């Protein structure tokens, strides 16, 4: 088989775990959203090729600088996430996540993912961030940050609706093959 290792990184609460769940289940969990995603091998097809894509969550490792790197070895693609409803999370992409992933996963493609896009226009969201003199992350900011950090691609999705979830992983899988 073609076996590839994917590791997903980014700030806590920016939807990492949820994202991995919808992709692997192809359903947003209706009744209960689980905290835990165990290491899991998912099957995906891209550009006609069958792939075993090993999925590693890092939720809960954000505070622990010398535990997180235990996840990095042999990584074939990184999914680097920020949440569209948190421009704080986007500023941490160049600030924390990129230098760490470049240092521990050199020459490994990165795909930058804007999670939670279903909130760019949630009203309740816009205010709370208008409080802090902020507003939802805009697509152009996402794409410019991708080019700035040298990402293979930029994608957005929403786990709630599933919109773009599959595509995130398809891109991530194409990146792992190049």
């Amino acid at each position: 088989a073609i076996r590839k290792k994917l590791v997903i990184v980014g700030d806590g609460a920016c939807g990492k775990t949820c994202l991995l769940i919808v992709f692997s289940k192809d359903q947003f969990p209706e009744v209960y959203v689980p905290t835990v995603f165990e290491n899991y091998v998912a099957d995906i097809e891209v550009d006609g090729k069958q792939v075993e894509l090993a999925l590693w969550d890092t939720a809960g490792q954000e505070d622990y600088d010398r535990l997180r790197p235990l996840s990095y070895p042999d990584t074939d693609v990184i999914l680097m996430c920020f949440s569209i409803d948190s421009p704080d999370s986007l500023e941490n992409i160049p600030e924390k996540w990129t230098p760490e992933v470049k240092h521990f996963c050199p020459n490994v493609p990165i795909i930058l993912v804007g999670n939670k896009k279903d909130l760019r226009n949630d009203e309740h969201t816009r205010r709370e961030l208008a409080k802090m003199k902020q507003e939802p992350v805009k697509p152009e900011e996402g794409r410019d940050m991708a080019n700035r950090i040298g990402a293979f691609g930029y994608m957005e999705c929403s786990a709630k609706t599933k919109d773009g979830v599959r595509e995130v992983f398809e891109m991530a899988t194409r990146a792992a093959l190049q």
């Binding site: 009744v31 209960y32 689980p34 905290t35 835990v36 165990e38 290491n39 899991y40 091998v41 075993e52 090993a54 590693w56 969550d57 939720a59 809960g60 490792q61 505070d63 622990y64 600088d65 010398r66 535990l67 790197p69 235990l70 996840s71 070895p73 042999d74 160049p94 600030e95 924390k96 990129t98 230098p99």
Partner: protein, 356 residues
């Protein structure tokens, strides 16, 4: 599956939504604990017991990869049994805090953190070793493909599997924080879960520190053997002469990283530098050698005799200023890979300075 639609099927309707949510999170803790235990048992049976009994590697290598697996198992097994005792008194679980404190507080915290630290600390090094050995020893490689082909590995490699103690430990604050959210505030129960959650974080802090220290010592041991302090037994500035027998093996390392040294005018000098506890060591990378050479400038700074300063035009550079009145009226200008990096480097250096 799922608690509502699972057990609690008859009992679900007379409960509030907050109490439904609360029982789902519990249910998830309990089911994932069993699942973790099962994973440790695949490590045991498919890999460890077989490595031992067939002598796939020396005893001393094996003990570094599985220092204390039986003990680790029993930590999680004991708690799992206590969980099951609880589930027994009816499918709606009630107060849970005592069971949490019984694993994560007091002596129980001291035990778990020590046993996990011991199991994880050396892991990155022992997995490199395992990777090497697969590359170099056809029998070991064949034994690995074979063991990993077993169904219980669920298509995971040993290494996808062995990291699970660490990942598990990172789930506990999240699990607790989410039980708490659905627990009635102002209860002893709520207060005690908060305590348990705080203790889980501390335990993670401890395991973090153990990995750090164990990796850093092994790395420094490696650096020492590549250390050329030959252009020092007769230096040209007594500033640098005392470090002619410098042993990195006796200091703790805080940070390390590549740095470009604007030593003069549009001349530069690529380094790899170690932020140790008492010292900043500038090293030059000769092939696979590490040179502690002069220029002239000393290549080793005592941190109690420096100041660190930012830079007005360059978001990547920072200054190191020797205030030891007998030395460089010249500063050391160092450039990091990036602004983030230069930042990181700045903070750690300011901190280490403060404590020097």
């Amino acid at each position: 599956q799922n608690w509502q639609h699972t057990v609690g099927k008859d009992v679900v309707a007379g409960l509030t939504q907050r109490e439904i949510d609360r029982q789902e999170v519990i249910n998830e803790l309990f089911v994932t604990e069993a699942s973790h235990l099962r994973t440790l048992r695949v490590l045991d049976l498919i890999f460890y017991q077989r490595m031992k009994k067939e002598n796939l590697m020396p005893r001393e290598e094996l003990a570094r990869l599985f220092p204390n697996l039986p003990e680790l198992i029993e930590i999680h097994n004991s708690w799992c049994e206590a969980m099951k005792k609880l589930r027994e008194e009816g499918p709606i679980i009630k107060e849970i805090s005592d069971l949490m404190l019984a694993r994560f507080d007091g002596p129980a915290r001291e035990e778990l953190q020590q046993v996990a630290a011991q199991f994880c600390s050396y892991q990155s090094i022992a997995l490199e070793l395992i990777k090497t050995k697969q590359r170099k020893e056809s029998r070991f490689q064949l034994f690995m493909q074979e063991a990993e082909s077993h169904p219980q590995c669920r298509r995971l490699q040993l290494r996808d599997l062995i990291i699970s103690e660490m990942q598990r430990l990172t789930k506990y604050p999240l699990l607790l924080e989410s039980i708490i959210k659905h627990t009635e505030g102002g209860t002893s129960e709520h207060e005690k879960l908060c305590r348990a959650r705080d203790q889980c974080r501390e335990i993670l802090k401890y395991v973090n520190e153990a990995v750090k220290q164990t990796e850093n010592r092994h790395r420094l041991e490696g650096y020492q053997k590549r250390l050329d302090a030959t252009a020092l037994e007769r230096a040209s500035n007594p500033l640098a002469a005392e470090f002619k027998s410098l042993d990195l093996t006796t200091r703790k390392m805080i940070h390390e990283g590549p740095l470009t040294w604007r030593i003069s005018k549009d001349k530069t000098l690529d380094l790899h530098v170690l932020l140790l506890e008492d010292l900043l060591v500038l090293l030059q990378k000769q092939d696979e050698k590490l040179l502690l050479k002069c220029h002239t400038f000393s290549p080793v700074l005592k941190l109690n005799a420096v100041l660190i300063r930012s830079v007005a035009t360059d978001k990547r550079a920072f200054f190191i200023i020797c205030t030891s009145k007998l030395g460089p009226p010249q500063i050391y200008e160092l450039v990091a890979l990036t602004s983030s990096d230069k930042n990181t480097w700045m903070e750690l250096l300011e901190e280490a300075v403060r404590n020097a």
